[PDB]
Amino acid sequence: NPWWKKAVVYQIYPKSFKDTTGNGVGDIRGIIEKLDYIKELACDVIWLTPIYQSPQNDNGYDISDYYSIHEEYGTMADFEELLEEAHKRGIKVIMDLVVNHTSTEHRWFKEAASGKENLYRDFYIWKDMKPNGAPPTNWESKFGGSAWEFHAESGQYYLHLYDVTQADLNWENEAVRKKVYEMMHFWFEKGIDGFRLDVINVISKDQRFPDDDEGDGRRFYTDGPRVHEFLNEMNREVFSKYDSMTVGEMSSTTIADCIRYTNPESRELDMVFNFHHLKADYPNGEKWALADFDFLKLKKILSEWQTEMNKGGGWNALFWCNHDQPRIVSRYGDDGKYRKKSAKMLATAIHMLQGTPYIYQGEELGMTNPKFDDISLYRDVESLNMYRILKEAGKPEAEIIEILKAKSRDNSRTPVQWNGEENAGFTAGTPWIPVPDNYKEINAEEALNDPDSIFYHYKKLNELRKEFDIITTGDYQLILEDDQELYAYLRNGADEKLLVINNFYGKETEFQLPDDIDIEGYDAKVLISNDTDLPESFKRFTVKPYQSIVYHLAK
């Protein structure tokens, strides 16, 4: 059984983790200083978002040199000391791998853009104007507008699925692939334990580059004709030579493809993230619009991914949070009265699923969205732009602010709140982004000194995954599918079950075990609960607001 199957991963966004230098920006030395904290949480993998040399046009996802570290974050010596101090504590480290595109400041692009005959020209994707003066395709960039950028000096457009200074690498080019693999070897040989592969399912483009009527063009590069081939090749050349863990981040993918990506027979990736459960509060798929989450759809989404991947032999990365997503307690939980209870409930809801769980820095503290009530507190360029545009269109100030409070991509980027000192102890300087005033009540020092804290609830969930094999091997069975408040399910094992019951809302409601649930001869014991008010009988009882209970049933 691979070491990653029962692992729990702690996601670190270094800019906002811990500043040890006083410049207001988190750094690698800060992570080192926190390894004992991460071990205390009982995570055994650390995942760092991009720390590579980069102009920082796109939050580090525009990489100008894969072999060195952004100076702000520290030195390569720091990094190697982090690998060494981590491994000594039994913690593995995986890196973020961004190889769909490079910065246009990368050596290869500067060379390639110089002319149609430069050696590196075909490292990127170039096409001519259409006769009608239109771009090569009508495909849209995910940052909006055309996915093609004209390069005057050479007379062609290069492709960018993402931002303008993020030029898509040409994966049809075997030369490019080999260079990527060499780069991957460099890091593995340095001693990292794996990679999360950023938007990896878009590297295979339809080489006929046709126009998209019915859409924005994503139909022509998402889970494309050669993605499985490329990943498997990457497996043979790189992943197969190390004791590694690889997780792919998928854009707009499908269950069928994710089964192929992660079934061990494919020799592609170990697991994948998909984001469908994090779109359950998008009205009509509009990412910036306000709405309450659709609970039944959420349950349906989680259950499909559980049962289908289980049947297909695939593996899910399990998570609620990212540097790009709202903090989960504010989003699907209650960040007021029931902040602690609902944070624990959400943690249990997803950790008791089949797969490998990911904790985003500060989630274990129940950090909330910061509720910044003024435009000067925000940093994310997309938020600043959105405020500018909505202001120009005459939306009132308070209404724009409400939108940013729910949707700004800064929301989970505020500094980790360590203690109740200045700037929550994140920095002795001025943080690059403000700390909200809740820090005095919400911080690690306070959580670590409260036996009933969210932090220790996560610790227990993390250790349970090591202690109870059914969390890894049990199937998944949804019950109470139509219930408007309860998310409940079973994990069925060999004369052993888990029954997990989560109230997703702040009202009392009844749980009754369905008649088809055959538990004859099983004894029940509480595995973990966020409430000491335990039912006389789990078979029928009144669930308290945001109550979360897991029963361990055995013969």
Report residue 396: phi and psi, to 5°. Answer: -65, 150
| Minimum gap (Å) between residue 23 Cβ and Mg ion | 5
Judge whether 443 is annotated as a binding position: no
Q: Which of residues 532-551 bind Mg ion (CB under 5 A)?
A: none
Residue 93 known to bind ligand: no
Rounded to a whole number, what is the largest CA-CA distance in the chain? 78
The pairs formed by 137-146 with CB atoms below 8 angstroms and a separation of 24 or more are 137/209, 137/210, 137/211, 137/212, 137/217, 137/220, 138/211, 138/212, 138/217, 139/211, 139/212, 139/216, 139/217, 139/220, 140/216, 140/217
138 scored as a contact of Mg ion (CB under 5 A): no
What region, left, alpha or beta, does residue 199 occupy, with left being phi > 0 and alpha being psi -120 to 50 degrees?
A: left
> Which one of residues 21, 118, 263, 473 is an interface residue with Mg ion (CB under 5 A)?
21
Q: Which is nearer to Mg ion, 19 or 78 (CB)?
A: 19
Q: Which residue is nearest to Mg ion (CB)?
A: 21
Neighbours of 152 (CB within 10 A): 6
Residue 267, token pair as written in the block: 């020799």
Q: Which of 168, 249, 281, 364 is catalytic?
A: 249
Q: Shortest gap between Cβ of 282 and Mg ion (angstroms)?
A: 35
Contact region with Mg ion (CB under 5 A), list: 12-20, 161-169, 219-227, 282-290 = 12-20
Measured from the CB atom, the residue of 207 and 430 that comes closer to Mg ion is 430
Q: List 317's β-bridge partners, or say none.
A: 356
Question: Is 27 near Mg ion (CB under 5 A)?
Answer: yes
Is 449 assigned to a binding site?
no
Q: Which is nearer to Mg ion, 23 or 266 (CB)?
A: 23
- 249: annotated active-site residue: yes
Secondary-structure percent of the chain, ordered helix, strand, coil, rounded to 5: 35, 20, 45
CB of 11 to Mg ion, least distance (A): 19
Segment holding 263, helix H or strand E: none
Contact region for Mg ion (CB under 5 A) — 17-25, 135-143, 356-364, 382-390?
17-25
Task: Return d(Cα 98, Cα 361) in angstroms, integer.
Answer: 21
Options 24-32, 59-67, 112-120, 345-353: segment touching Mg ion (CB under 5 A) = 24-32
Judged by CB under 5 A, which stretch of 23-31, 172-180, 275-283, 519-527 contacts Mg ion? 23-31
Quick check: 323 and 535 in contact, CB under 8 A?
Answer: no
Which of 51, 197 has the CB closer to Mg ion? 51
Burial of residue 449, with CB atoms counted within 10 A of its CB: 0-12 exposed, 13-18 middle, 19 or more buried:
exposed
At its nearest, how many Å lie between Mg ion and the CB of residue 31? Answer: 11
Q: Which lies closer to Mg ion via its Cβ, residue 25 or residue 197?
A: 25
75 lines the binding site for Mg ion (CB under 5 A): no
Instruction: Kindly tell me which of 13 and 261 has the beta carbon lying closer to Mg ion.
Output: 13
Contact residue for Mg ion among 11, 13, 19, 223 (CB under 5 A):
19
Least Å from the CB of residue 83 to Mg ion: 19
What's the closest the beta carbon of residue 93 comes to Mg ion, in angstroms?
A: 19
Query: Which of 23, 75, 114, 173 lies at the binding interface for Mg ion (CB under 5 A)?
Result: 23
CA distance 401 to 376: 11
User: What interhelical angle do 174-190 and 76-88 show, nearest 10?
Assistant: 60
- 23/114 with CB nearer Mg ion: 23
Q: Tell me the C-alpha to C-alpha distance, in Å, between residue 64 and each of 56, 99, 106.
A: 9, 11, 4
Catalytic residue status for 198: yes
Q: At 435, is the secondary structure helix, strand, or coil?
A: coil
Q: Count the Cβ atoms, other than its own, within 10 Å of residue 228.
A: 17
Build a one-symbol-per-residue string for 80-109: x at contacts with Mg ion by CB under 5 A, - elsewhere: ------------------------------
Give me the least distance between CB of 20 and Mg ion, in Å please: 6
Nearer to Mg ion, 222 or 427 (CB): 427
Count of chain residues binding Mg ion (CB under 5 A): 5
Q: Could you tell me the two tokens for 360?
A: 């985003």
- The response to whether 469 counts as a known ligand-binding position is no
Q: Which of 447, 452, 472 is nearest to 528 (CA)?
A: 452
Q: Which two tokens stand for residue 180?
A: 């990527």
Instruction: Establish whether 294 is an annotated binding residue.
Output: no
Tell me which residues in 203-222 interact with Mg ion (CB under 5 A): none
Tell me the closest approach of the beta carbon of residue 429 to Mg ion, in angstroms: 8
Only segment of 27-35, 78-86, 309-317, 376-384 that touches Mg ion (CB under 5 A): 27-35
Asked if 374 and 341 touch (Cβ cutoff 8 Å), the reply is: no
Report the distance separating Cα 87 and Cα 99, nearest Å: 26
Shortest separation between residue 87's beta carbon and Mg ion, angstroms = 24
Q: Token match 């989450």: residue?
A: 293
Write the single-letter amino acid at 64: S
List the 271-273 sheet strands across, edge first. Answer: 271-273, 245-249, 194-197, 92-97, 45-48, 9-12, 356-360, 317-318
Q: C-alpha distances in angstroms, 534 versus 141, 281, 456?
A: 52, 31, 19
Cβ proximity to Mg ion, 25 vs 343, nearer residue: 25
Catalytic: which of 58, 163, 168, 198? 198
Residues belonging to the chain: 555
Annotated binding site for Mg(2+): 19, 21, 23, 25, 27
Residues lying near Mg ion in the complex (CB under 5 A): 19, 21, 23, 25, 27
Catalytic residue positions, numbered? 198, 249
Annotated binding site: 19, 21, 23, 25, 27
